[PDB]
Design a protein around this ligand. Structure first.
Ligand SMILES: [Cl-]
Ligand SMILES: [Mg+2]
Lengths: 231, 241, 235, 111, 243, 244, 250, 240, 195
């Protein structure tokens, strides 16, 4: 009310309203799902269009051969953060000849988002990210929120009506975690998960966006006729 | 009324932020006192440790700035420590640049000038503290100089600071009316500490145990704080008289 | 007052949302993408009859394979175009090739959000960036001051945008010829324009693989206007 | 006085055919009259069917290859996974090299 | 009024309302504790299991500074991480110049001055965390607790977060019943109990226990996490006491 | 942050006026009147000191009239402290021009630059404008004798006769009435004093409440002399014209 | 972080008033009375030493300050603002004058430099004006003896005699009756003490009054001998005993 | 540095500071530009509340940017000096690098670009000035007349006016100026410009300034008597 | 670059400047004009380091032309020469100084007097009846000491100048490919085409 003019101001109950309003931009964004087994990690994203004449807004971004994310909210902020991740992944490779750990990737994003919430003039990032990766400690899935809070999970979903997919994954936890050495079945579980967040619309050929990373699989994105298999 | 939020003049020629910083001084509810002997300068302060979980050895409002200068603070600990760290750096730098130990009164002026800057420049707030500096200066002898959030400073024959400061002040005033002199006519610093504690007991009207007090003593070429057992020994001497 | 980069309670940047209102006040611009080329057309909208309408430059060349049409506070577009042209030429210098239409659009959209307390406010102008490259062929992009860009088969921006977009929805198909697309822009411009459409108050342009980006003459557009009126009367 | 350059020796060779191309190089690395390695490769697969070697001062050579490999990576990110053509790679390398016009990479480069 | 809208503005009381508002964010956060022991310190924290989908043991909240200092905090987790990052820089520059690892009191002031600096200007926000930290140095064991204002003291036991009063009460009993001192292995077991008892103030979601420790004898003066058999032993001890 | 306390000194009103410039002009309207009159053979500068006290040292005082170089002088109306900042800039600017071209600065060039400085304070920087209006009186070999004025807006204009400060409306009417183009310096001296004597808020105009200066070619052959009048010299010129 | 106050905190109000300057002058009005009188062969400046506490040593607090060997200064208003001005005034005398010309600045020019500092606090970003009025007394070879007043605006005026602060209105009236152009220095010290007794309420002696003169050269106060041209400082601060001597024949 | 974003968007999609700068232009004295077949003429109003002026030394309303291009304006006078100076510097800089004087379109584009930069730069307000820029390109006999405004938009005009009561004089020019046949001679163009100002001015004495620009750096300012002859001729023909 | 001369007579200033531009063992050009018009009644000839000469001349030209437009007034030859001297005086203590020597010939319209200023690359200004830079002076100065009179006409000045060029063509080691002569007077600047 009087305490939402900028990010530098706390409310009387100890709340940062600009950070909460940035969080609200994620809820308006299109649904995306993340899940993993022990061998692979999968991102499934529902893309959104302006109208029938427009293209469908690309949700998934590659960061390295072994890491990438899906976005929900302000796309330009996801571009800024994914670019920062690309640089940090790249710095780790050039200097240390070392693939960047997915956990450290999260720690770096947390600290970048935090600085924007404690200084005058700047603003919080208006986007949520789901980072998947395969590193030296197996498959990983992270959930980034622009408050700074990063969380490692077996599965999750963010965006509009994400609670439907999140409930499904909470029931299916024991099934999909043991889909080891089988990419297609782990995607199928992810496609079935995102389907629980659909209303009126259904998954079409240029609407669905899938990505996968794993043991002997680089981070690759599937769009168009390549995702017709999973409808 | 944004003239009450930052350090600019109000219609009646006042700086409200400076005045409110003065009120932050008493937020700890601690009373301090400082007096001068022949050879020494004693400073005493109340020590209140309410929480049982606190480590009482780390609860302190007296600071060793340099080897010769000591400082007691009335005000919140963060601002107290802020002021202490800066004073330490300033005293060290002074020695390096000018080849001799920074006098008590010169440090007081320097910290006062820094406090003045916060009353004029808008981006910096005043510190909510009153800094009492004590030493045995090699030129001026026993010395007590005190700084406040307004940037004011002055030397003292003796002084007191805190919520019940006025009761302690008049207690000391009445003594110096009677003695007809500027200091405590006493040979050892031990008895000057006994004087300081005695006159605080009379003014505040409370008794003190060893853990209720905190004592700093400045002699020629060193300033030091007393331990609990050093104070207990000092309390026993008062009781047996 | 309040911060420039402040979020509203609904999760949108105030200044970005206000700049979008400025773009709605601007003159109409329409783009249509086909397999034979991309057409760009604009409403000139002279404020007075004494103003020489040929000096109204609302369609602009970025490179030989990329064109651009604008709508809103058109003065703000000068530094955007300047950056686009430099980006296009600079890429050719570094890589000895034409730059992808998408990569050019992305480079322009990076400027968009570089504002705050960098420039003092967002841009008050939307751009239609039309071009061709070897990889993705004929492309039309809509670049906003939010930093977002969408590819389109066809798109209208400006004051008559919502009315024109609904018309483009029905009329566009994947087998449109270039000639058909030229007439369709003129048709839809004439519908949404306040004053009566002619060669002086409206301008056409296109980009083809063979001839590159070309702004049409007033003589050439006039014949396409005459051809359009005859075809509508013919049924 | 400190000399920032050295000569690691070796030799490389590129030949182009009708539908193929070779880039060869010996595996010996040397300083003065001593052998450092009998097998230290200096012809590298950089991706996009581009092979590269930067023979001369090995530290500058490795630095350049490392930078070009990185340039290929960022070309994919910035331009939608587009294949870097051999002619485009060449022009990119010119800018890498000339960027150090006044403190050069002491290498003969072949791709 | 309007004295609470801007940081670094004194109210007519002499208070900085923005700092007090940051304390409310700390009070909202999960419970965390610190226990000083014979030859070291023990830290513990409550991790709320929001979902089955959280990977157990893989959202670590306790952070190490240098090799000998442990830090835990309650409130805004990102703010805590920012403070530790600074701590690590402060500890690194101390060791760079002075060779010896940073003493705990020395380290405590480096954070304290940094946190206090964020109450001096309106262009910055105060920290939304109370930080419990400590370790073992040349002078023995030290435990500290630092607050949004920059205020810190040494502690025998320390607690902060939503269940601070429950934990404080339980800590006060340990100080009374063990005047000669508490051992390192005991303090790990007690820490588990106190988190389980303090969980009664946050009992909608069930939780995950996380403990760490520095001890001159048990961990050789270095910070380590309690895992495996020793962790399960402390959990079982805590489970037996609640029933 | 600090946005809360920003007055925004360099903005437009809805009517298209600069708030701070208008208010600075309102300040200047209460300052002591200063008059400039340009004759064919010289220039007069006259100014009224602000409510003098009897114990003010009059002979070793400088409030209104300042020397910029040997050929140019200014009469001040507004904040003296502000004027001195601008005067020292102008003095320096004159010496830069002399050092560069080995020629005394043309009057307009000095005026333009000083007025451009004032302009800057109204368009950028977020600072308050200078609460000062100048009357520039000077000579160069291009335009001869010249009178200019500048104000806080940074706008300057040329004049045959002009007043700034208090009662300019009444003063300008009286100058417009009695001024003519073939006028001499001695006549202009008399006009300047008569105008102040009628527009003054004081009871009677006396020597101790005035500063006076002339710029004549009254030196020996084709050269300009600046005369800043002494107290006794103002007393004599006041008796000579029949005011006291 | 960083000083984000790059804008003026003193601005013109619709009426043409500069609010902060007016309010600074109000702070000067509240302040303790000080005065200055110019004689034929000297200048005197004086003020009351308002003690904050009787335990406080009023000797350590110096309201009358030496700026150069021939120039002194006294104030009314906020003491801390005065103290920093004296520091800056002393330094500027060296940097902008003595290090260039090899000699101390004349009174009028040092006053001008102080005025400049006080004007900048009226216009620069993120600062309030100084809450003091200064009275600067001094001597230099070509201007002789002089006395200046400097206000928060940065404006300065030369005076034969004047007073500032608490009871300035009454004090200026008293000085108008007693001042003439033939006053010797001792006569001016006498008048200064008479004028100051009116404004002082409590004790009136050498320990509660601070008074200094700009008079003849003092070779004894120079510290060295041998250079004939160097004859010593014209600024002298009168001792507590020296004041009490003149209070008996009052 | 002073960073504040002074020019910003409002809920209805307007930048008020830019729009309020247009009000300053509307307050300013009227200026008119008319281009003929082989010339351009710039007319300017001078308000007659100022007597006892010295017209020798007072800043003239029309300013030469180069020997072949001129700039008149309406709005804040102090602001206009800054634009003129920048334009003059750019005019010489163009000659230095391209070895050819500026085109009128290029000089306009530069000045307009400066005006635009001040609508989205931190710490600055927009220029309270609209300009009319007129002249002839190098080795070209086609007349050029351009207009700029605080927002930064610019465009070419057969004839145009700006400043106070400009909507009255634009109404006059819209019916009296024929596109098919512009003023064939210098006299015809000056007369139409003087006529258009006489709709607004008051008296045709020392209130109207006229500056004629012809090809190949041929610029001259008319005197009082020369302008007064047009005023005398128009009034006699009017009485009919 | 090499030979630049200057002669001030009764009513004009005459500047002669060599046409050759040599680099290495090749005369690249034999028709080079080593001068720039700074203003209608002021001409500057120049000689020195390759590149620096023209860059400096044009930089000065731009500044004087800017002044002319701003004030609508021609700067005096004395004023221009002082501006040029100061630029060279700054230059000499720079990281890389302009190695350019100049002659400034102008007609002062206020005084109705021709003026010739000789300024070297250090910023050493002198007003002279006749001037030269480089080795040229070693022949021409002694020749002009003898033959020069202050009251000469422009035609007499051109014959005096011919006498200098003949001597230089006889005794100089390098072929400088003759000179371009220009006259500066009350009516402005004009070039003598047949010399
Ligand atoms: Cl200091
Ligand atoms: Mg020479």
């Amino acid at each position: 009310n009087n305490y939402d003019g900028d990010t530098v101001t706390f409310s009387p109950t100890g709340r940062l309203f600009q950070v909460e309003y940035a969080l609200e931009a994620i809820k308006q964004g299109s649904v995306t799902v993340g899940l993993r087994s022990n061998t692979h990690a999968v991102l499934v994203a529902l893309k959104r269009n302006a109208d029938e004449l427009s293209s469908y807004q690309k949700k998934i971004i590659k960061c390295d051969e072994h890491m990438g994310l899906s976005l929900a909210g302000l796309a330009p902020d996801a571009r800024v953060l994914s670019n920062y991740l690309r640089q940090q992944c790249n710095y780790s490779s050039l200097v240390f000849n070392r693939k960047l750990a997915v956990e450290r990737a999260g720690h770096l994003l947390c600290d970048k988002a935090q600085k924007n919430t404690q200084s005058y003039g700047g603003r919080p990032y208006g986007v949520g990210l789901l980072i998947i990766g395969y590193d030296k400690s197996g498959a990983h899935l992270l959930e980034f929120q622009p408050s700074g809070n990063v969380t490692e999970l077996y599965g999750t979903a963010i965006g509009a009506r994400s609670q439907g997919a999140k409930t499904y994954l909470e029931r299916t936890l024991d099934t999909f975690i043991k889909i080891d050495g089988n990419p297609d079945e782990l995607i199928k579980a992810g496609v079935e998960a995102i389907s629980q967040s659909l209303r009126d619309e259904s998954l079409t050929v240029d609407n669905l966006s899938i990505a996968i990373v794993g043991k002997d699989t680089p981070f690759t994105i599937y769009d168009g006729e390549a995702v017709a298999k999973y409808i | 009324g944004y003239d009450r939020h930052i350090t600019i003049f109000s219609p009646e020629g006042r700086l409200y932020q400076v005045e409110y910083a003065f009120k932050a001084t008493n937020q700890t509810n601690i009373n301090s006192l400082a007096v001068r002997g022949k050879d020494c300068t004693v400073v005493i302060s109340q020590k209140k440790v309410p929480d049982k979980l606190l480590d009482p050895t780390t609860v302190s409002y007296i600071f060793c700035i340099s080897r010769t200068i000591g400082m007691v603070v009335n005000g919140p600990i963060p601002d107290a420590r802020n002021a202490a760290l800066r004073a330490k750096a300033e005293a060290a730098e002074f020695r390096y640049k000018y080849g001799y130990d920074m006098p008590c009164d010169v440090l007081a002026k320097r910290m006062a000038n820094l406090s003045q800057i916060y009353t004029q420049r808008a981006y910096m707030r005043p510190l909510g503290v009153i800094l009492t500096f004590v030493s045995v200066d090699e030129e001026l002898g026993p010395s007590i100089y005190k700084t406040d959030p307004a940037g004011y400073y002055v030397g003292y024959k003796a002084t007191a600071t805190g919520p019940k400061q006025q009761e302690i002040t008049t207690n000391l005033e009445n003594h110096f009316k009677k003695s007809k002199i500027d200091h405590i006519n006493e040979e050892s610093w031990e008895k000057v500490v006994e004087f300081a504690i005695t006159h605080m007991i009379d003014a505040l009207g409370t008794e003190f145990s060893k853990n209720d007090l905190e004592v700093g003593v400045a002699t020629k070429d060193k300033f030091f704080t007393l331990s609990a057992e050093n104070i207990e020994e000092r309390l026993v001497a008062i009781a047996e008289q | 007052d309040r911060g420039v980069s402040t979020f509203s309670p609904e999760g949108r940047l105030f200044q970005v949302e206000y700049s979008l209102e400025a773009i709605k006040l601007g003159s109409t611009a329409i783009g249509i993408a086909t397999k034979e080329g991309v057409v760009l057309g604009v409403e000139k909208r002279a404020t007075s009859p004494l103003l020489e309408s040929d000096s109204i430059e609302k369609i602009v060349e970025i490179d030989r394979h990329i064109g651009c049409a604008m709508s809103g506070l058109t003065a703000d577009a000068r530094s955007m175009i300047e950056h686009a042209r430099t980006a296009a030429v600079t890429h050719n210098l570094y890589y000895d090739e034409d730059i992808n239409v998408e990569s050019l659009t992305q480079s322009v959209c990076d400027l968009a959000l570089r504002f705050g307390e960098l420039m003092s406010r967002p841009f008050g102008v939307a751009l239609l960036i039309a071009g061709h490259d070897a990889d993705d062929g004929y492309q039309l992009f809509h670049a906003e001051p939010s930093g977002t860009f969408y590819r389109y088969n066809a798109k209208a921006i400006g004051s008559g945008s919502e009315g024109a977009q609904a018309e483009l929805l029905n009329e566009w198909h994947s087998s449109l010829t270039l000639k058909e697309a030229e007439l369709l822009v003129l048709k839809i411009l004439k519908q949404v324009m306040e004053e009566k459409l002619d060669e002086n108050n409206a301008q056409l342009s296109c980009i083809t693989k063979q001839d590159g980006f070309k702004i049409y003459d007033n003589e050439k557009t006039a014949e396409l206007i005459k051809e359009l009126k005859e075809k509508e009367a013919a049924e | 006085q400190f000399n920032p350059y050295g000569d690691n020796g070796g030799t490389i060779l590129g030949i182009a055919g009708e539908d193929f191309a070779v880039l060869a190089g010996d595996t010996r690395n040397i300083t003065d009259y001593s052998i450092n390695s009998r097998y230290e490769p200096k012809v590298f697969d950089c991706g996009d069917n581009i092979v590269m070697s930067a023979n001369g001062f090995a530290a500058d050579g490795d630095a350049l290859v490392k930078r070009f490999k990185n340039s290929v990576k960022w070309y994919h990110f910035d331009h939608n996974d587009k294949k870097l053509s051999i002619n485009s790679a060449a022009r990119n390398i010119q800018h890498l090299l000339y960027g150090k016009r006044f403190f050069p990479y002491y290498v003969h480069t072949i791709i | 009024t309007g004295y609470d809208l801007s940081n670094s503005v004194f109210s007519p009381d002499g208070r900085n309302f923005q700092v007090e508002y940051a304390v409310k964010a700390v009070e909202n956060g999960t419970t965390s504790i610190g226990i000083k022991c014979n030859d070291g310190v023990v830290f513990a924290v409550e991790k709320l299991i929001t979902s089955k989908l959280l990977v157990p043991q893989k959202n670590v909240k306790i952070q190490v500074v240098d090799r000998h200092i442990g830090c835990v905090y309650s409130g805004l987790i990102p703010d805590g991480r920012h403070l530790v990052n600074r701590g690590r820089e402060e500890a690194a520059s101390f060791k760079k110049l002075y060779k010896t690892p940073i003493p705990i009191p020395a380290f405590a002031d480096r954070l304290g001055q940094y946190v206090q600096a964020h109450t001096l200007y309106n262009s910055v926000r105060p920290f939304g965390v109370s930080t419990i930290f400590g370790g073992v140095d040349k002078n023995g064991a030290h435990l500290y607790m630092l607050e949004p204002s920059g205020s810190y003291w040494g502690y025998k036991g320390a607690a902060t977060g939503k269940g601070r009063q429950s934990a404080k009460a339980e800590l006060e009993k340990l100080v009374d019943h063990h005047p000669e001192g508490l051992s390192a292995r005991e303090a790990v077991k007690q820490a588990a109990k106190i988190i389980y008892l303090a969980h009664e103030d946050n009992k909608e979601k069930d939780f995950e226990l996380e403990i760490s420790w520095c001890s001159l004898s048990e961990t050789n003066g270095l910070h380590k996490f309690v895992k495996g058999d020793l962790l399960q032993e402390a959990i079982d001890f805590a489970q037996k006491e609640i029933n | 942050g600090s946005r809360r306390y920003d007055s925004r000194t360099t903005i437009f009103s809805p009517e298209g006026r600069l708030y701070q410039v208008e208010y600075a002009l309102e300040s200047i309207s209460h300052a002591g009147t200063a008059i400039g009159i340009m004759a064919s053979d010289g220039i007069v500068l006259a100014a009224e000191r602000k409510v003098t006290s009897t114990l003010l040292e009059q002979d070793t005082s400088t409030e209104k009239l300042y020397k910029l170089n040997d050929k140019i002088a200014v009469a001040v109306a507004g904040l003296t402290a502000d004027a001195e900042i601008l005067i020292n800039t102008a003095r320096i600017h004159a010496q830069n021009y002399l050092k560069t071209y080995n020629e005394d600065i043309p009057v307009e060039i000095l005026v333009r630059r000083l007025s451009d400085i004032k302009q800057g304070y109204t368009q950028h920087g977020g600072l308050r404008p200078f609460g000062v209006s100048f009357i520039y009186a000077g000579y160069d070999d291009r335009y001869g004798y010249q009178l200019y004025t500048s104000n806080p807006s940074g706008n300057y204009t040329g004049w045959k006769a002009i007043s700034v400060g208090a009662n300019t409306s009444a003063a300008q009417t009286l100058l417009q009435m009695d001024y003519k183009d073939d006028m001499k310096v001695d006549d202009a001296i008399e006009l300047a004093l008569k105008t102040l004597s009628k527009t003054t808020d004081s009871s009677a105009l006396t020597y101790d409440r005035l500063e006076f200066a002339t710029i004549r070619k009254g030196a020996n052959d084709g050269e300009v002399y600046q005369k800043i009048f002494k107290p006794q010299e103002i007393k004599d010129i006041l008796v000579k014209t029949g005011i006291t | 972080m960083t000083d984000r106050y790059s804008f003026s905190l003193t601005t013109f109000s619709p009426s043409g008033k500069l609010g902060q300057i007016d309010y600074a002058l109000t702070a000067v009005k509240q302040g303790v009375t000080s005065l200055g009188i110019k004689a034929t062969n000297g200048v005197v400046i004086a003020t009351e030493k308002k003690s904050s506490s009787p335990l406080a040593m009023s000797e350590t607090l110096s309201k009358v300050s030496l700026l150069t060997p021939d120039i002194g200064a006294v104030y009314s208003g906020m003491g801390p603002d005065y103290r920093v001005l004296v520091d800056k005034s002393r330094k500027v005398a060296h940097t902008s004058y003595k290090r260039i010309y090899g000699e101390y600045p004349p009174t009028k020019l040092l006053v001008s430099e102080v005025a400049k500092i006080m004007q900048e606090a009226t216009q620069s970003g993120g600062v309030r004006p100084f809450g003091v009025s200064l009275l600067i007394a001094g001597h230099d070879e070509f201007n002789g003896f002089s006395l200046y007043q400097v206000d928060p605006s940065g404006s300065y005026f030369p005076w034969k005699a004047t007073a500032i602060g608490k009871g300035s209105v009454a004090a200026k009236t008293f000085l108008e009756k007693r001042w003439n152009d033939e006053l010797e220095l001792e006569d001016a010290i006498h008048i200064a003490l008479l004028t100051l007794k009116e404004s002082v309420e409590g004790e009136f002696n050498g320990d509660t009054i601070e008074l200094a003169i700009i008079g003849d050269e003092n070779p004894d106060l120079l510290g060295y001998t041998g250079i004939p041209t160097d004859k010593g400082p014209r600024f002298r601060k009168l001792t507590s005993q020296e004041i009490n001597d003149r209070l008996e024949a009052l | 540095g002073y960073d504040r974003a002074l020019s910003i968007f409002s809920p209805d999609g307007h930048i008020f500071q830019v729009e309020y700068a247009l009000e300053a232009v509307k307050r300013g004295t009227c200026a008119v530009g008319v281009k003929g077949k082989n010339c351009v003429v710039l007319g300017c109003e001078r308000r007659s509340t100022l007597k006892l002026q010295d017209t020798r030394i007072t800043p003239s309303k029309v300013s030469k940017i180069d020997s072949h291009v001129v700039l008149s304006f309406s709005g804040l006078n102090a602001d206009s000096r800054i634009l003129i100076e920048k334009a003059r510097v750019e005019a010489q800089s163009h000659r230095l690098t391209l070895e050819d004087p500026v085109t009128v379109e290029y000089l306009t584009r530069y000045v307009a670009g400066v005006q635009q930069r001040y609508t989205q730069s931190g710490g600055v307000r927009p220029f309270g000035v609209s300009t009319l820029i007129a002249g002839f390109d190098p080795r070209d006999d086609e007349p050029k007349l351009y207009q700029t405004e605080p927002s930064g938009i610019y465009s070419s005009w057969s004839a145009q006016t700006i400043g106070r009561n400009s909507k009255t004089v634009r109404e006059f020019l819209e019916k009296n100026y024929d596109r098919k046949e512009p003023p064939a001679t210098v006299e015809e163009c000056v007369k139409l410009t003087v006529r258009s100002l006489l709709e607004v001015v008051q008296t045709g004495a020392k209130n109207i300034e006229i500056t004629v620009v012809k090809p190949d750096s041929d610029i001259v300012a008319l005197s009082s008597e020369e302008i007064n002859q047009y005023v005398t001729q128009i009034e006699q023909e009017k009485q009919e | 670059m090499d030979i630049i001369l200057g002669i001030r007579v009764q009513d004009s200033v005459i500047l002669a400047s060599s046409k050759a531009v040599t680099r290495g063992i090749s005369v690249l050009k034999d028709s080079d004009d080593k001068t720039r018009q700074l203003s209608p009644h002021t001409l500057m000839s120049f000689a020195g380091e390759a590149g620096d000469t023209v860059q400096f001349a044009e930089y000065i030209q731009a500044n004087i032309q800017l002044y002319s437009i701003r004030e609508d007034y021609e700067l005096s030859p004395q004023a221009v020469s002082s501006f040029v001297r100061q630029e060279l005086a700054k230059s000499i203590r720079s990281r890389r100084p302009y190695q350019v020597n100049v002659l400034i010939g102008g007609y002062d319209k206020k005084k109705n007097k021709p003026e010739l200023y000789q300024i070297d690359y250090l910023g050493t200004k002198v007003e002279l009846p006749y001037g030269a830079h480089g080795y040229s002076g070693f022949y021409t100065f002694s020749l002009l000491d003898h033959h020069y009179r202050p009251d000469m006409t422009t035609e007499e000045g051109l014959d005096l100048l011919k006498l200098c060029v003949q001597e230089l063509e006889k005794r100089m080691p390098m072929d400088f490919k003759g000179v371009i002569v220009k006259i500066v007077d009350k009516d402005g600047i004009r070039q003598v085409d047949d010399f």
